[PDB]
């Protein structure tokens, strides 16, 4: 499950003079009860190293944007699923959170994590905007979270009129480094992003972080907090 | 409604993007066509506001290596710059690949077509590459070439359509002969030769497509499709004559509005031995339009062996495909996977780049390096020139069953027979 890391998180806060780091419990985060219960059901106990700094920023009042770098098994996914689930209102039957995955097979993987952690949200439903979904033109998605690969997601927001992107509250880009390396994905994501509202929360996660990826991250996450955790 | 189909046996595979011209200050708005390709000799011709550039095609094609940023633009590549006194809005090549036409607008003098003998580009003993003949369209603003097409089988013959609605058929040998013309009141908006090159089809402001012998004697009228009302009147924007009784026809708002979006319509025609009406199928906006600032223009081409049509549009960042069905009569959109599409990039200032020119190379001899370990045979390469001055090449991999390789080895250009100024 969690990968070990002696190292420390480096944190560039969006606001230099507004220190607000480090939660050492989930109970501190003032999650909705059904979200904390979700967490509990998953067996989590303490936030992970990356989560300890990442969650207070993402779940700030109001939420803040983030570029985060940490290796596999640090808890990135868990952290952003919490992020999306805490903004979602199931009452409202239309997409509010939008997660981009570099592949089909991860779009589903992350989906499962969303479904498991959102277990106690009544009527929470997920759409998968990925290769080979069945949807006919004319339809409009009533699922409150959408996960998928950038091209199909872009179609749903534009061409096909499936999602109104002006209504999304949280946008996640998982695995930036892999994303960019895939044909089409960078431009696709930029195109999605640009049509999200100003107040949308943007979050971006990568394992690696070379200059291509950093410069991409800057186009996509305005006014970011940046977090790095050196690999071990 | 619109027929569509997930195609997993076709992918566009991006090669590195290559900068040709420097990024412009403003978005280029006017109808233009700035890429030509010699598939006989392996040359590409690119034009802009800023000269004409000729490359050996293989120099423009560079494959991504694992490790490389597939979004990094190569800065330049060796080719030849031919200075031009005025900006170019249209480039085209004759069917023998020996005559390049370059259309220019001068604010002072109006429009002129320059004709280059393609050997002159190869003539090391000419430091300056001059055209051998001009053709001056007395016209100034209404003299913009808006469509111009060489005959697919008569090398000396070219069809030219201007903004004012007039049209002309030219014969270009060692000099320029006007063979046929039709005045502006005919209202031509677009033009396209029959496959064998025996007739000319012209799109028109009134929404019809008229067929003509090269002498411009009228042969057949295709009426404006019945589904368009009188209070939503349209004009042919572009036309592609695919088979004798088969056409792709693009309609746009008669009045010039950019806001409405064009309809790509497939049309099947009856025969003399039929009294059926014309069958039209509206596929509508297969190249999704993100831009309402540019003059509409669909870049259409048919690839017989694959029985499909490639489509690009001045208002869209995406290339679309319309294939004939196993059926052999009807057409369908191909819906391709996210990482196998052909899209122009976002400019570094975060705007969309759009197409100014579109061609396909069939002289590529390099094999596609897939994994470390896997390699596929050479494929044709789609090439787009963007509004940002970047060239965008994509291999077209058609893995559908029974499709025969379209690759054709190129020849050396001999200076023999070069025409002089
Ligand atoms: N705070 C936590 N406590 C216990 N397990 C966790 C915690 N956060 C994540 N995990 C588990 O550890 C694994 C890695 O989490 P994940 O969010 O997938 O890491 P990453 O996204 O960085 O690859 C998963 O099995 C996940 O359920």
Solving technique: X-ray
**Best of A128, A175, A184, A213 to disrupt the B interface by mutation (most B CBs within 10 Å)?**
A184
What residues does B180 pair with on adjacent strands? B169
Structural contact between residues B390 and B17, judged by C-beta atoms closer than 8 angstroms: yes
CA dist., res. A76 & res. A206, Å (int): 9
CA dist., res. B176 & res. B133, Å (int): 7
**Beta carbon pairs, A and B, within 8 Å:** 57
**A39 alpha-carbon distance from chain centroid:** 16
B334 contacts chain A (CB < 8 A): no
Pocket of ligand 1 (CB under 6 A): A 1-2, 44-45, 47-48, 51, 72-78
Per DSSP bridges, beta strands A66-69 and A201-206 are parallel
CA dist., res. B200 & res. B208, Å (int): 14
Residue B318 CA to ligand 1 centre (angstroms): 38
What residues does B105 pair with on adjacent strands? B111
CATH code of the region A1-232: 3.40.50.300
Contact residues on chain B for A212, CB-CB shorter than 8 A: 69, 71-72
**Best of B63, B286, B338, B371 to disrupt the A interface by mutation (most A CBs within 10 Å)?**
B338
A130 CA to chain B: closest CA distance, Å?
9
Strands, sheet with B4-6, edge to edge from the N-terminal-most edge strand: B4-6, B331-335, B320-324, B308-313, B298-303
CA dist., res. B27 & res. B353, Å (int): 9
CA dist., res. A231 & res. B5, Å (int): 44
Tell me the two tokens of residue B287: 């190249």
Tell me the two tokens of residue B222: 């295709």
Q: CB A212 to CB B346 under 8 A? A: no
Answer positive or negative: Cα dihedral of B15, B16, B19, B23.
positive
CA B163-B52-B100 angle, 5° bins: 65
Find, in chain B, the residue whose alpha carbon is nearest to that of A184: B339
Per DSSP bridges, beta strands B390-398 and B18-19 are antiparallel
Please return the burial class of A36, using the count of CB atoms within 10 Å of its CB with bins 0-12, 13-18 and 19+.
middle
Q: CB A187 to CB B345 under 8 A? A: yes
Gapped junctions in chain B, after residues (C–N > 2.5 Å): none
The residues spanned by each domain of chain A are: 1-232
Find, in chain A, the residue whose alpha carbon is nearest to that of B349: A219
Q: CB B346 to CB A190 under 8 A? A: yes
Find, in chain A, the residue whose alpha carbon is nearest to that of B72: A212
Q: Cβ neighbours of residue A21 under 8 Å, at least 6 residues apart?
A: A11, A13, A52, A53, A56
Q: Cβ neighbours of residue A39 under 8 Å, at least 6 residues apart?
A: A26, A31, A82, A117
**What is the 8-class DSSP label of residue A231?**
-
Structural contact between residues A89 and A122, judged by C-beta atoms closer than 8 angstroms: no
What residues does B210 pair with on adjacent strands? B202, B221
CA dist., res. B137 & res. A8, Å (int): 72
Residue B195, Ramachandran bin (φ over 0: left; ψ between -120 and 50: alpha; else beta): alpha
Gapped junctions in chain A, after residues (C–N > 2.5 Å): none
The residues spanned by each domain of chain B are: 1-398
Tell me the two tokens of residue B47: 């034009």
Q: Which of B301, B304, B338 has the alpha carbon at shortest distance from B318?
A: B338
Collapsed DSSP state (helix, strand, coil) of residue B227: coil
Tell me the two tokens of residue A81: 């699923």
Structural contact between residues A191 and A156, judged by C-beta atoms closer than 8 angstroms: no
Contacts of range B245-250, beta carbons closer than 8 Å, 24 or more positions apart: B245/B269, B245/B270, B245/B271, B247/B201, B247/B209, B247/B222, B248/B300, B248/B302, B248/B309, B248/B311, B248/B322, B249/B203, B249/B209, B249/B222, B250/B298, B250/B300
Find, in chain A, the residue whose alpha carbon is nearest to that of B15: A183
Tell me the two tokens of residue B197: 């090159």
B237 CA to chain A: closest CA distance, Å?
22
**Residue from the list A152, A158, A190 with its beta carbon closest to the beta carbon of B288:** A158
Residue A58, Ramachandran bin (φ over 0: left; ψ between -120 and 50: alpha; else beta): alpha
Answer positive or negative: Cα dihedral of B73, B76, B78, B81.
positive
Q: Tell me how far CA of residue B401 lies from CA of A113, B309, B398, in angstroms.
A: 40, 18, 9
Structural contact between residues B170 and B156, judged by C-beta atoms closer than 8 angstroms: no
B1 contacts chain A (CB < 8 A): yes
Q: Which of A222, A227, A184, A177 has the alpha carbon at shortest distance from A200?
A: A222
CA dist., res. B165 & res. B142, Å (int): 8
Q: CB B350 to CB A194 under 8 A? A: yes
Q: Tell me how far CA of residue B278 lies from CA of A37, B182, B207, B211, in angstroms.
A: 65, 27, 14, 15
CA dist., res. B52 & res. B45, Å (int): 7
* DSSP per-residue string spanning B318-357: B-EEEEEPTTSS-EEEEE--GGG--BPPBPTTSPBP-EEE
**What is the 8-class DSSP label of residue A121?**
S
Residues in chain A: 232
Report cis status (omega within 30 of 0) of the bond before A62: yes
**What is the 8-class DSSP label of residue B316?**
B
Q: Which of B11, B345, B337, B394 has the alpha carbon at shortest distance from A152?
A: B337
Residue A161, Ramachandran bin (φ over 0: left; ψ between -120 and 50: alpha; else beta): left
Q: CB A159 to CB B288 under 8 A? A: yes
Structural contact between residues B184 and B166, judged by C-beta atoms closer than 8 angstroms: yes
Tell me the two tokens of residue B271: 């025969």
Q: CB B6 to CB A149 under 8 A? A: no
């Amino acid at each position: 499950n969690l990968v070990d890391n002696t190292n420390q998180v480096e944190v560039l806060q969006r606001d230099p003079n507004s220190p607000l780091y480090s939660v050492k419990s989930f109970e501190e985060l003032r999650l909705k009860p059904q979200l904390l219960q979700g967490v509990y059901a998953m067996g989590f106990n303490r936030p992970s190293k990356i989560q300890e700094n990442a969650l207070p920023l993402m779940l700030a009042e109001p939420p803040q944007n983030l570029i985060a770098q940490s290796q596999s098994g640090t808890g990135k996914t868990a952290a952003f699923v919490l992020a999306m689930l805490s903004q979602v209102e199931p009452a409202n039957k239309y997409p509010q959170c939008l997660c981009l995955s570099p592949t089909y097979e991860l779009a589903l993987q992350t989906g499962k994590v969303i479904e498991q952690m959102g277990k106690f949200y009544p009527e929470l439903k997920l759409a998968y905007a990925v290769r080979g979904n069945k949807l006919e033109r004319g339809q409009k998605i009533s699922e409150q979270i959408v996960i998928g690969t950038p091209g199909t997601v872009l179609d749903w927001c534009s061409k096909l009129k499936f999602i109104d992107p002006k209504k999304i509250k949280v946008f996640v880009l998982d695995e930036a480094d892999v994303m960019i390396a895939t044909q089409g994905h960078q431009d696709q994501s930029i195109r999605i992003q640009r049509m999200l509202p100003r107040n949308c929360q943007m979050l971006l996660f990568s394992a690696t972080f070379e200059d291509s990826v950093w410069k991409f991250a800057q186009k996509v996450v305005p006014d970011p907090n940046v977090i790095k955790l050196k690999r071990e | 409604m619109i027929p569509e189909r997930e195609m997993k046996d076709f992918q566009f595979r991006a090669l590195k993007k290559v900068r040709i011209f420097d990024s412009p200050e403003e978005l280029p708005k006017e109808r233009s066509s700035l890429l030509a390709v010699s598939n006989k000799y392996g040359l590409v011709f690119a034009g802009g506001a800023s000269g004409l550039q000729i490359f050996p095609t293989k120099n423009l094609l560079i494959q991504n290596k694992p490790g490389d940023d597939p979004n990094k633009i190569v800065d330049k590549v060796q080719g030849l710059l031919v200075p031009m006194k005025f900006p170019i809005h249209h480039l085209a090549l004759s069917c023998d690949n020996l005559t390049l036409s370059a259309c220019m607008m001068s604010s002072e003098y109006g429009s002129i077509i320059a004709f280059f003998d393609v050997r002159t580009f190869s003539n090391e003993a000419k430091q300056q590459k001059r055209p051998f003949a001009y053709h001056k369209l007395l016209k100034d603003a209404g003299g913009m070439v808006i469509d111009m097409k060489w005959n697919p089988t008569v090398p000396s013959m070219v069809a030219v359509c201007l903004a004012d609605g007039s049209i002309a058929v030219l014969q270009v040998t060692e000099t320029v002969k006007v063979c046929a013309t039709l005045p502006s009141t005919v209202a031509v908006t677009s033009v396209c030769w029959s496959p064998k090159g025996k007739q000319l089809a012209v799109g028109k402001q009134n929404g019809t497509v008229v067929q003509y012998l090269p002498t411009l004697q009228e042969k057949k009228v295709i009426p404006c499709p019945p589904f368009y009302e009188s209070d939503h009147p349209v004009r042919v924007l572009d036309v592609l004559w695919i088979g004798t009784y088969v056409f792709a026809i693009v309609y746009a708002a008669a009045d010039g509005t950019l806001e409405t979006s064009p309809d790509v319509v497939m049309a099947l025609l009856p025969k003399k031995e039929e009294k059926h009406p014309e069958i039209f199928v509206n596929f509508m906006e297969p190249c999704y339009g993100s831009c309402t600032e540019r003059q509409h223009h669909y870049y259409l081409s048919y690839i017989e062996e694959w029985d499909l049509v490639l489509a690009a549009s001045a208002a869209s960042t995406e290339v679309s495909i319309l294939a004939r069905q196993s059926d052999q009569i009807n057409w369908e959109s191909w819906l391709l996977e996210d990482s196998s599409r052909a899209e122009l990039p976002v400019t570094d200032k975060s705007d969309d780049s759009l197409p100014m020119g579109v061609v396909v190379d069939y002289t590529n001899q390099v094999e596609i390096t897939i994994s470390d370990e896997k390699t596929l045979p050479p494929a044709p390469v789609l090439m787009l020139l963007s509004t940002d001055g970047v060239l965008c090449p994509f291999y077209m991999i058609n893995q559908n069953p029974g499709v025969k390789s379209l690759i054709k080895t190129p020849e050396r250009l001999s200076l023999e027979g070069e025409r002089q100024p």
